[PDB]
Amino acid sequence: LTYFSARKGKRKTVKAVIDRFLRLHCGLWVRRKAGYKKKLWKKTPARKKRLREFVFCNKTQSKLLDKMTTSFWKRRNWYVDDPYQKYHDRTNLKV
Amino acid sequence: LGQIYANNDKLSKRLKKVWKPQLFEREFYSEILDKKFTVTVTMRTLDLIDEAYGLDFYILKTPKEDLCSKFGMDLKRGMLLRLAR
Amino acid sequence: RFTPPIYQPKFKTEKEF
Amino acid sequence: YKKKWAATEPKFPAVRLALQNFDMTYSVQFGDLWPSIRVSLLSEQKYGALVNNFAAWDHVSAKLEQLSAKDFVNEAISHWELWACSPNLRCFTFDRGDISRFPPARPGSLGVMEYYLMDAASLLPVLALGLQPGDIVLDLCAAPGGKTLALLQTGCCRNLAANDLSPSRIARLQKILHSYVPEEIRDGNQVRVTSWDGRKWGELEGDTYDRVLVDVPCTTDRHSLHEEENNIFKRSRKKERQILPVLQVQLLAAGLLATKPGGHVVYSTCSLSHLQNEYVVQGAIELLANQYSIQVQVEDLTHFRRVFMDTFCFFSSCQVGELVIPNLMANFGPMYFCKMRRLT
Amino acid sequence: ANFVSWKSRTKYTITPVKMRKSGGRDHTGRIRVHGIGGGHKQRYRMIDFLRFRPEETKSGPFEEKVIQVRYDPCRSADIALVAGGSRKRWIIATENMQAGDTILNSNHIGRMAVAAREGDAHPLGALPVGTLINNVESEPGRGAQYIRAAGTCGVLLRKVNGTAIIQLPSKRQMQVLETCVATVGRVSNVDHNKRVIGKAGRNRWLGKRPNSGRWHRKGGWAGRKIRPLPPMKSYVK
RNA sequence: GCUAAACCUAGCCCCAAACCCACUCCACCUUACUACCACAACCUUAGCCAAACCAUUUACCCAAAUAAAGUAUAGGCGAUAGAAAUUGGGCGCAAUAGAUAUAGUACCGCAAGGGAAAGAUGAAAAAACCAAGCAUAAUAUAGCAAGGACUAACCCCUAUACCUUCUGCAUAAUGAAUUAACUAGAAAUAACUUUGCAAGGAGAGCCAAAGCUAAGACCCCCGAAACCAGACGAGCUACCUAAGAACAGCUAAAAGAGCACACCCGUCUAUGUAGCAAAAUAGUGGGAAGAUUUAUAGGUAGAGGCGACAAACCUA
RNA sequence: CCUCCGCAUAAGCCUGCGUCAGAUCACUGAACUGACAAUUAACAGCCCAAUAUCUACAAUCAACCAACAAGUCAUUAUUACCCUCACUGUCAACCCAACACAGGCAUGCUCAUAAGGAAAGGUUAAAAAAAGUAAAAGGAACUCGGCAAAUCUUACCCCGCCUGUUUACCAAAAACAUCACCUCUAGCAUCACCAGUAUUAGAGGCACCGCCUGCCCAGUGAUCACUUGUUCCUUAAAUAGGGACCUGUAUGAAUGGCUCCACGAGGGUUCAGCUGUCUCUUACUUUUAACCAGUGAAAUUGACCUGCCCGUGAAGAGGCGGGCAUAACACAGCAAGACGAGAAGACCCUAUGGAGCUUUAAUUUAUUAAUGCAAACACCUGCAUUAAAAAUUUCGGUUGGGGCGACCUCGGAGCAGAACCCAACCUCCGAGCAGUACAUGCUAAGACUUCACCAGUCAAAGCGAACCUCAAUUGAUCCA
Ligand SMILES: C[S@@+](CC[C@H](N)C(=O)[O-])C[C@H]1O[C@@H](n2cnc3c(N)ncnc32)[C@H](O)[C@@H]1O
Ligand SMILES: [Mg+2]
Ligand SMILES: [Mg+2]
Ligand SMILES: [Mg+2]
Ligand SMILES: [Mg+2]
Ligand SMILES: [Mg+2]
Ligand SMILES: [Mg+2]
Ligand SMILES: [Mg+2]
Ligand SMILES: [Mg+2]
Ligand SMILES: [Mg+2]
Ligand SMILES: [Mg+2]
Ligand SMILES: [Mg+2]
Ligand SMILES: [Mg+2]
Ligand SMILES: [Mg+2]
Ligand SMILES: [Mg+2]
Ligand SMILES: [Mg+2]
Ligand SMILES: [Mg+2]
Ligand SMILES: [Mg+2]
Ligand SMILES: [Mg+2]
Ligand SMILES: [Mg+2]
Ligand SMILES: [Mg+2]
Ligand SMILES: [Mg+2]
Ligand SMILES: [Mg+2]
Ligand SMILES: [Mg+2]
Ligand SMILES: [Mg+2]
Ligand SMILES: [Mg+2]
Ligand SMILES: [Mg+2]
Ligand SMILES: [Mg+2]
Ligand SMILES: [Mg+2]
Ligand SMILES: [Mg+2]
Ligand SMILES: [Mg+2]
Ligand SMILES: [Mg+2]
Ligand SMILES: [Mg+2]
Ligand SMILES: [Mg+2]
Ligand SMILES: [Mg+2]
Ligand SMILES: [Mg+2]
Ligand SMILES: [Mg+2]
Ligand SMILES: [Mg+2]
Ligand SMILES: [Mg+2]
Ligand SMILES: [Mg+2]
Ligand SMILES: [Mg+2]
Ligand SMILES: [Mg+2]
Ligand SMILES: [Mg+2]
Ligand SMILES: [Mg+2]
């Protein structure tokens, strides 16, 4: 990715990242399952449900995603009626 | 002078293109100059003359930029000098 | 398959006291 | 390894290689007959519709009669009298010079396809068995089917043995017998389907079958000329052909070891090649008469020939058994069939 | 490049004029014709191919006397120097034109066919049908273009209602008017074809240069295969 | 004790400020620097490179710093690209450094073009020691050159040079004659560490559920064959053009004839191989009035020319 | 004693062995430095008032003769026209090759000089090396081969007709060209071809000449009638009938084979001689050499106080182990070792490195030409199509010594002994589904996992209803 822009000399975000992942303010990232729209006739219903769910990403994936994205995307946003509002903060977390 | 994509798909080869206007040699009469001219023109010019209702009007109304002709400007200079004098 | 020779500039050899 | 070679062999297509082999061999064998066989082979294969007895056979018979197709076995049986042929079999064919294709098979009222489209030549070896009610039939090479379906249509067989080495082919065999033959007739070991080496059968089961049909792997003459992929004549698979003739003897022998004393074995080949027509049967019969010491006699089918003379053409220069040759008037698959019973 | 043509003379003369060889080069300076190089230096003699050209302030059918018939470097055909009135000019000589012969040049179209003598020049309409002719023009007063090589002859095939069909030496027809003029007979130096260049030197003298060393497979492209029948081409043994 | 060593100042670099020189007499676009006679300029940059290949694609100055914002948006929706409204003198070099510069000179190249090196007394010249290499002063059994020692230099005993790439490697393989000088780790997110202030931090913009502000501390050097644009080259060689010049003697029915000088070429041998020579010499050979050889001037130019095609030649 | 050199002009160079004073292989001097001189035009360069107009016939002792490739050299009419010798080159031992270089270098006169030059610094007479001269008897026995020296032969064969051309610097040929013969294309003007025109011009093939080798023209009757073919008129449309036409031309091969003269620094064989090529080498001279005197390089070089044998290092030790040997120091030879020195590395492999060439590889048609449709009233412009000619880019991976391929994903079988994983490579067997439901609905605790991620797998409870088999059976993102 571009560490120093040629116009302004600041970092740039990889837009491939932004249209695939949701980052929560706490530091987690959310993705969809790969192939959730693919060939559903042959898949079993349990398999289908496992596909529909929005999952988290492990530490390294999360680290890589944060490097590929600017500080703007990491700020706290007070959207009106976002369905992900509750998930922004953690609860009862000791290490 | 520009470039094009081969079959109006950006994934195809890029090529150099030049679009040239169609030209016609035509005869005009200037009322102020009382002179017959034969000049190379386009359909656009003929259309503008029609809308302005004569060569003199076309020459006199049109600014320098739109005329795009040294000879157009020289015609203009003469006519304006004739009106002045 | 041929290497041309190279001469050093003449000024060094023409040095005097 | 050496990358550069002085002269590389020409890249012949496999179908052309088949024709090359056929041209250099069958020319000497057939002489003036070869051109007519050649022209027929390169031409379309005419088909027959074998009616499923388990379907509404009467309506299908009426339907195929309306479409100007005659049942050949019925008319053959009419003039048969002027051992018995296999009854309860009905396959309709078009008359000579009528090249029209039969409409594809569709499922009937009972949920089974009303007829099966296959070469009426391949129907002859089943007729060659003198099948009687309460007989036990061994079919050493079953898949993909056709002959097996005909054996089932006869309804004279108490138990069926179906065997093929490749599970790929037995799969389609399973499919066709499931789709054509109802579950009621399958029941329990009335149809046994197995995927083992046919050669082992000789020492696995002996004196167990009164009727055997042996459809040995052949050069697949018509199939080789038309089909490109998985061609037996592909030059890479040359090695197979060297071990092709012996295999045939082995498989035949397994049948002759498994048959009852006085039991009937019919041997069929889809090829015209003499080395795998007569050389095989004489090789098999000598093996078992010498090593194992079993007397086997071979019947002449000249009486069988004269009946289907109107429907089929027969090569006259065959020593024993019968071969059918393709001609454009009545185009049917090249096939050899011979009937034999072991005396003791 | 700095190239000037040598053909800058504007006034007709009889005197031999110095030529410059091209070598197959253009004004651009690059070769455009292969196999041309310096042979023997040659002087050009101007030829008046407008056979009916009456003298200054003179009109009507005229007459000339043959003086000489001389080898020409710059063509195959032999040339004749003719004088008449007070004029000398070079022309193309026919089969049988010796010195002292008298030649006629006319523009008269007779109702009846004129004398089918050789060396004389009449309008095509004047000439009879089937007569051997040379130095023909396409349009009147243009000048001879067509049959002006050694031993070459065309024939008048048909004349109908103001059109003449002549067949060139290529056995090919051409339409022309009768108002156009043609001289009668076959051109000089027959058996120019029967000339044997002895050795390579002879050709080099004539200003030719040798054919290139490089091997050509063919000048013509192979007939392009069709999509239905590719396998039929290059069917391997 | 030689060869040497040592030097401080010519000047230069980055800024700021400010809009620059176009010059006695003579000559100078013809073969420039030569007193003196009848054609004409404006015309999309490409490519390397990135995409770990490559084929669409890949930042390049456009007229206010900051912020909006790496946002909207664009894109083999991938590499990557990317708005707008709106807001508003010296912690420099000091002769291998610093300019290439004592100078675009000498020198090198047909031309375009390439391109150096070096100096040092004192107010006045009208006045001591240290690199390598050597010398003073060659050498005495035995062996990575030393170490342990010893009264004692050697003798005694112990001891398989260095770097780099390989699992070992003693040694194998690259690299080093030696001395002096010069010659190679540049930066973000996020964390940690230490401060200030604290539900707020920051000298607009931004962040904040103890955070925010500031600082500290992390990302090398030399090397291809190539590709593209614009100039320069046919004084060598290939071919052509113009106007020339050369070819003794002898035999020949007289000739791209024969023998054979000068000339042109280069078959075979030997010498030479940092040479006399970046292709020569001695002898022996091929042609030697011809498709011959040769002097002068001109022409054809690299996406090309030229070619009795050898992938030949177009300044070793 | 030597001279294939000289003297001159041109071309190139630019004061570069004249004088005088200091100064430094060779003079303490000169081809060094400084100062001073010089090359004189008659030779040569440097030219010409205008407009028309003229200029057919070679050169070669040009005579006789003889050609072919067809050739360097001329004016006249009228007008205008009276001043004079200016300007420049002129030297030398000299130029292009980095050099005072065995090389390159045009013409005239001298063809051996009337001009121009000097192979030996001194000595000695080793080896090895170079170039000569002679050699008993033998005469190719040498050798890949008569290479070389000699001597100054003969008959053939293969290939190419010949003279010619070619890889400047490893190939001179059997390759190329070539007379002749054959194929293709072109019916025509003012920059090539060409001031040409089908007996011509261009693009090619083969290689002279001399011979043998030439047909899909429709069959039978006999220039005549039928039978065919091709068209039409029928025919619903065919068994197919009825009319029309094929006698205004006519062959054919850039086809193949066989002789033959002459020629060749071509390749092979051979007779006769000949010679130190050899049996088997020798002697002398010159060069070199080695010494004395002067001048004075280059590759190379970790440091070296630098031995032999055996072992070790698998091969490979001066240096490691065990023995043995051993005062120090020049000069001359030799080439066994120092994996001796020097190079644009010969071969094999690799690089998601280049480049040249070809094409039926992929992408195209920017260019050129033709055709069509618009526009305009023959060209031009836009759009489209068909060809030519181009351009840009690529050439995955594993395994294969006498081949003419097998593989690449998933599941088994031989190897796997008892939690997990693991018998490579290879040799084999299968899979790219099928059948049955149609609650193969929704939702959700906790777990398993093919050693990562992606994927994959099991499932309690709950909401609503009812009283699956199968070893594998499969495919991310973008995009549509
Ligand atoms: C020629 S086909 C039988 C003809 C066909 N089923 C019919 O009835 O018309 C024989 C089949 O046997 C199979 N096969 C091969 N080896 C076999 C063996 N050892 N035992 C049995 N069948 C074998 C082959 O795959 C081949 O397709
Ligand atoms: Mg030719
Ligand atoms: Mg050729
Ligand atoms: Mg790339
Ligand atoms: Mg890279
Ligand atoms: Mg400096
Ligand atoms: Mg400098
Ligand atoms: Mg020292
Ligand atoms: Mg010791
Ligand atoms: Mg490495
Ligand atoms: Mg080594
Ligand atoms: Mg030249
Ligand atoms: Mg040449
Ligand atoms: Mg001669
Ligand atoms: Mg000669
Ligand atoms: Mg070649
Ligand atoms: Mg080659
Ligand atoms: Mg004079
Ligand atoms: Mg003298
Ligand atoms: Mg001397
Ligand atoms: Mg000496
Ligand atoms: Mg000796
Ligand atoms: Mg002797
Ligand atoms: Mg011998
Ligand atoms: Mg011998
Ligand atoms: Mg010899
Ligand atoms: Mg020859
Ligand atoms: Mg060479
Ligand atoms: Mg040459
Ligand atoms: Mg040579
Ligand atoms: Mg040839
Ligand atoms: Mg020759
Ligand atoms: Mg020596
Ligand atoms: Mg000495
Ligand atoms: Mg050296
Ligand atoms: Mg050893
Ligand atoms: Mg050593
Ligand atoms: Mg020594
Ligand atoms: Mg290499
Ligand atoms: Mg590449
Ligand atoms: Mg590989
Ligand atoms: Mg297993
Ligand atoms: Mg796992
Ligand atoms: Mg529940």
Describe this structure in words.
This is part of a larger assembly, with chains A (95 residues), B (85 residues), C (17 residues), D (344 residues) and E (237 residues). Chain A is α+β, with helices and mostly antiparallel strands. Chain A is built from 3 helices and 3 strands; from the N terminus they run αββαβα. In chain A, strands 1-2-3 form a 3-stranded antiparallel sheet, with no helix packed on it. In chain C, 0% of the residues lie in helices and 0% in strands. Chain D has 344 residues and is of the alpha/beta class. Chain D folds into 2 domains: 12-118, no CATH class; 119-344, no CATH class. Helix content of chain D is 35%, strand content 18%. In chain D, α6 (147-154) links the parallel β5 and β6 (157-163). The chains are: A alpha+beta (95), B alpha+beta (85), C little secondary structure (17), D alpha/beta (344), E mainly beta (237). Chain D binds chain E through residues 10-13, and chain E through 231, 236-237. The structure holds S-adenosylmethionine and magnesium ion (43 copies). S-adenosylmethionine binds at residues 122, 140-147, 163-166, 169, 197-199, 215, 217-218, 251, 270 of chain D. Chain E binds 2 RNA strands through β2, β3 and α1.
Short description:
Chain C: Component of the mitochondrial large ribosomal subunit (mt-LSU). Within the mitochondrial ribosomes, required to direct the nascent polypeptide toward the tunnel exit and position the exit at a distance from the membrane surface. Chain B has helices at residues 43-52, 55-61, 64-67, 70-84, and strands spanning 2-5, 14-17, 24-30, 35-41.
Helix content class of chain D: 25-40%
Tally of individual helices of chain D: 14
Estimated structural class of chain D: alpha/beta
The gross shape of chain C turns out to be: rod-shaped
Choose one word for the global shape of chain D. Answer: globular
Q: Span between N and C termini of chain D?
A: 59 Å
Q: Which value, in Å, is the CA radius of gyration of chain D?
A: 20 Å
Bound molecules: S-adenosylmethionine, magnesium ion
Largest sheet of chain C: none
Label the structural class of chain C.
little secondary structure
- Helices of chain C, by number, come to 0
Number of structural domains of chain D? 2
| Share of helix of chain C, binned | under 10%
The total strand number of chain D stands at 12
**What fraction strand of chain D?**
15-25%
Largest interface: chains, residues each: D-E, 4 and 3 residues
Query: Could you give the distance between the termini of chain C?
Result: 43 Å
Question: How many strands in all of chain C?
Answer: 0
**Biggest sheet character of chain D:** 8 strands, mixed
**What string gives the helices and strands of chain D in order?**
HHEHEHEEHEHEHHEHEHHHEHEHEE
